[PDB]
Structure 1
Amino acid sequence: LIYTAGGYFRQSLSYLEAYNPSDGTWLRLADLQVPRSGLAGCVVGGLLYAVGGRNNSPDGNTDSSALDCYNPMTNQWSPCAPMSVPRNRIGVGVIDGHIYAVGGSHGCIHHNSVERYEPERDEWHLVAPMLTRRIGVGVAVLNRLLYAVGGFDGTNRLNSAECYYPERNEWRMITAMNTIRSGAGVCVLHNCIYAAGGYDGQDQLNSVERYDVATATWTFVAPMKHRRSALGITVHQGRIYVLGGYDGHTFLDSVECYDPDTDTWSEVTRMTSGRSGVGVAVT
């Protein structure tokens, strides 16, 4: 099932909920220990991890270096070692069972730094920094290479993407997206890096485009029905789901589903309550 952790609606949230695309219904689980928005989620060894973010509350706005791990058959969170720095609006990806933490912000500092986590050793380690400072960065893994896509460097929203090679611990710029996207949902479906929605400094976006590594080309596909940034994104049974986000007016509860065979989006469910800035992963 598709798990959503954290989010924002008037304050950062602690919710953990699971949607099942078969039954159409939602299941409510254990709260995060600390509320977080702007976090990322991923799954390693079947366990779901919540990475970075910020606790935006009536009493504070503290950026998060936390890493916490949740177990689906214990329904228990337990803390792991924290990162070198707080990273709000972080991106994450998984290569070889290891979590890479990319970019994000701490106050007015916009990180280009990156670090890697080891679940069997509960250790963070710093790797090579990106070429670009990127908050609201989208991250994807394809052929075991790590891609950092879009974001905001503090002045400009970005259409650039760059690629990390783990045996070359070096960053390489690639072909830019057609669209500037901060806070897009970025995932891999088929064997393309998809970038959906986001914010370009003027409008929240409903357009979607995908990267083919062999031809180094980005191509548009069908747009979502409603513009959205700070969406959670995941792939389930060969299909993309986008969860919530902010459309410039409303915190959406809409969940849209992209069918790649038809190049069609459909509204499939409502989240229990509208929210943005979640971490999503499937297990």
Structure 2
Amino acid sequence: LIYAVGGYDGNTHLNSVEAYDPERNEWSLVAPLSTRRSGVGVAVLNGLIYAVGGYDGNTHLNSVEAYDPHHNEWSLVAPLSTRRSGVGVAVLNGLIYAVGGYDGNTHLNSVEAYDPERNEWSLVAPLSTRRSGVGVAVLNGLIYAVGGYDGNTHLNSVEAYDPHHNEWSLVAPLSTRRSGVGVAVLNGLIYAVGGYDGNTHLNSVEAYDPERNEWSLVAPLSTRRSGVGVAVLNGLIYAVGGYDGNTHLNSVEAYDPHHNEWSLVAPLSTRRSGVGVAVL
């Protein structure tokens, strides 16, 4: 299932959570979060969905909660060291990494890692650049931080974290500055989906080949989408919700890399931008 967690429907921040079953092309609502959360990072570890940070409408959040699908329950665990909305979240070597974000009064280059065995976050090497609205994914044992916003420019830059040496290094930038970008890994490529370049919301999509350190543009989305959640299921990339510039979206579309095409599927129950999306 694809879980869509939190977000913003235009006129309220959401604690609701819904799950997509591709076999029936249906979304259904499950247990909500303890707290409304938009700009939330969402990752899967040891059979739980972790919802990390976010914005509840009136404060940026350091709290973290984990969803157990066997009991349809969220439970709060150890909070981040820093409030983080617009945070990117990925799983590597059994840790959850929280990458960048916005604490309310500064955009963050800091990065911290959660160990579920000890219920603790610890700070590791920071990014080269402050990044909120950053997309994060894991490929070949590295964490890639893709685009974002440093406070005073939207970013096309991309950097990769090597946990063996606790270091980030900059690689090839995107073709287009992208904040609020969704990122996922499929067939050994990183896809950067939509986002916002500073002066337009984007429908474009580009794929990174680490063997050649190159991004290349592929088929665009049907709709411009920033603040979009992206996940991979059954060999398709799903782009979930987002914001097209002039409406928040409930629509969902799926990318087939074999035919280089997106197609619209069942929409969410509610419009959701800044939504976190994970597969469990």
For the residue of structure 2 that corresponds to 1:207, the secondary structure is strand
Give a deviation string over 1:13-36, Cα, whole Å, max 9, x none: 011110111101222111101111
**Partners in 2 of 1:229 and 1:181 — Cα distance?**
9
Amino acid paired to 1:28:
L
Give the equivalent residue in structure 1 for 2:108. Answer: 111
RMSD: 0.7
**TM-score normalised by length of structure 1:** 0.97
Q: 1:185 aligned to 2:182?
A: yes
Q: CA deviation at 1:137?
A: 0.5
Give the equivalent residue in structure 2 for 1:15. Answer: 16
Give the equivalent residue in structure 2 for 1:88. Answer: 85
Alignment of 1:1-283 (within 5 A): 1-9=1-9, 10-56=11-57, 61-283=58-280
Percent identical residues: 53
Give a deviation string over 1:136-172, Cα, whole Å, max 9, x none: 0000100110111100000100000001110110110
**Partners in 2 of 1:185 and 1:264 — Cα distance?**
17
Equivalent residues of 2:13, 2:38 under 8 A apart: yes
For the residue of structure 2 that corresponds to 1:106, the secondary structure is coil
5+ unaligned residues in a row in structure 2: which ranges? none
**Partners in 2 of 1:144 and 1:93 — Cα distance?**
11
Equivalent residues of 2:27, 2:266 under 8 A apart: no
**Partners in 2 of 1:46 and 1:144 — Cα distance?**
20
Matched length: 279
Q: CA deviation at 1:84?
A: 0.6
**TM-score normalised by length of structure 2:** 0.98
Amino acid paired to 1:215:
R
Q: CA deviation at 1:108?
A: 2.5
